[PDB]
Amino acid sequence: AMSVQNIVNINESNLQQTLEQSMTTPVLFYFWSERSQHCLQLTPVLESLAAQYHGQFILAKLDCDAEQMIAAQFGLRAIPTVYLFQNGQPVDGFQGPQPEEAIRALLDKVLPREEELKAQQAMQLMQEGNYIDALPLLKDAWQLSSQNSEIGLLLAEAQIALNRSEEAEAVLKTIPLQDQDTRYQGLVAQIELLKQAADTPEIQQLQQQVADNPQDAALATQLALQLHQVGRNEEALELLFSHLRKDLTAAEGQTRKTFQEILAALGTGDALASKYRRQLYALLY
Ligand SMILES: [Ca+2]
Ligand SMILES: [Ca+2]
């Protein structure tokens, strides 16, 4: 049934739909009467909570004078009654006037928390491969949830698809041992595979040659270039930046040129690049 600000008036034409809606979205049934002075207080309050809650619950007004038989079916003892429905089943409710505060308390006890809504917005974005916009929702939701496991797993999954394996690892190390179940174990395996896939023969050999020659700018620069080949961009940038802090001519300007090519490749939309651009500017000028 179509709502206007998430209010529908119940009659025999829409009872069954609304009861069915209740399986997915909680429904606040409000048994009311034009003749009830108490309904005159309650009505305005319930309608504006129906506005302020943006579809998180539907208000189902049942006029008990116009719809006497539908009302007898619910088993009313007084008008007004307000009953929260979920799964076609009454959950909680009350009878008589109530301040806004008791109503919210009844509503918020059942409605999804901010972090759950955020997690669901993020899951949709991830559905649309928009991992990049899912990330801030998941960080937000994860903090709000006090770093709960379920959200944790989603946050790690997002960081992995974004090639932020280090960040994902840091999240997963957070998870209680008892929650290290199937999904978690798949994530840990992905990470190991990702790491292995980025640990190239050429990188391994250049690595050791810089471990033992921690001053050859040209060696560090070819390495940085290999790291870039496989998306290890942060390591490649920090290492090129280490040597630029010492000499801007490093390895005869190849350090600076490689540094700026990587930044070019990462584009304007990269937090990582944008960080390093500003450090570069401050260092050069
Ligand atoms: Ca378990
Ligand atoms: Ca400066």
User: For 1-113, CATH number?
Assistant: 3.40.30.10
Rounded to the nearest 5°, which phi and psi values hold at 7? -120, 135
Neighbours of ion ligand 2 (CB under 5 A): 282
Distance of CA 135 to the CA centre of its chain: 7
Distance CA 89, CA 69 (A): 19
DSSP class of 94 = E
- Which string of DSSP letters, residue by residue, matches 178-209? GG--HHHHHHHHHHHHHHHHT--HHHHHHHHH
- Which string of DSSP letters, residue by residue, matches 206-270? HHHHHHS-TT-HHHHHHHHHHHHHTT-HHHHHHHHHHHHTT-TTTTTTHHHHHHHHHHHHH-TT-
Is 50 known to sit in a ligand binding site?
A: no
Paired sense of beta strands 27-32 and 81-86, if any: antiparallel
Distance 180 CA to ligand 1 centre (A): 6
Distance 184 CA to ligand 1 centre (A): 10
- Which string of DSSP letters, residue by residue, matches 119-173? HHHHHHHHHTT-HHHHHHHHHHHHHHTTS-HHHHHHHHHHHHHTT-HHHHHHHHT
| Long-range contacts of 116-123, Cβ-Cβ distance < 8 Å, separation of 24 or more | 116/141, 118/144, 119/145, 119/150, 119/151, 119/154, 122/154, 122/158, 123/154
Q: Domain 114-197 is of which CATH architecture?
A: Alpha Horseshoe (1.25)
Q: Do domains 1-113 and 114-197 have the same CATH topology?
A: no
Q: Are 42 and 98 in contact (CB under 8 A)?
A: yes
Residue 105 CB partners (closer than 8 Å, separation 6+): none
Q: Are 175 and 149 in contact (CB under 8 A)?
A: yes
Residue type at 79? Answer: I
Distance 261 CA to ligand 2 centre (A): 21
**Axis-axis angle for helices 165-172, 182-197 (nearest 10):** 150
Distance 281 CA to ligand 2 centre (A): 7
Nearest to 231, CA basis, from 190, 203, 201, 192: 203
DSSP class of 177 = G
Residue type at 188? Answer: V
* Ligand (nearest to CA of 182): 1
In CATH terms, the fold of domain 198-285 is 1.25.40
**Which tokens go with 65?**
């004078």
Distance 180 CA to ligand 2 centre (A): 47
Q: Encode burial over 79-100: b for 16+ CB neighbours within 10 A, e otherwise.
A: bbbbbbbbeeeeeebeeeebee
Rounded to the nearest 5°, which phi and psi values hold at 16? -60, -40
Nearest to 134, CA basis, from 161, 107, 104: 161
Distance 176 CA to ligand 1 centre (A): 9
First to last CA, the chain: 64
Domain ranges of the chain: 1-113, 114-197, 198-285
Coil, helix or strand for 40?
Answer: helix
Q: Are 3 and 61 in contact (CB under 8 A)?
A: no
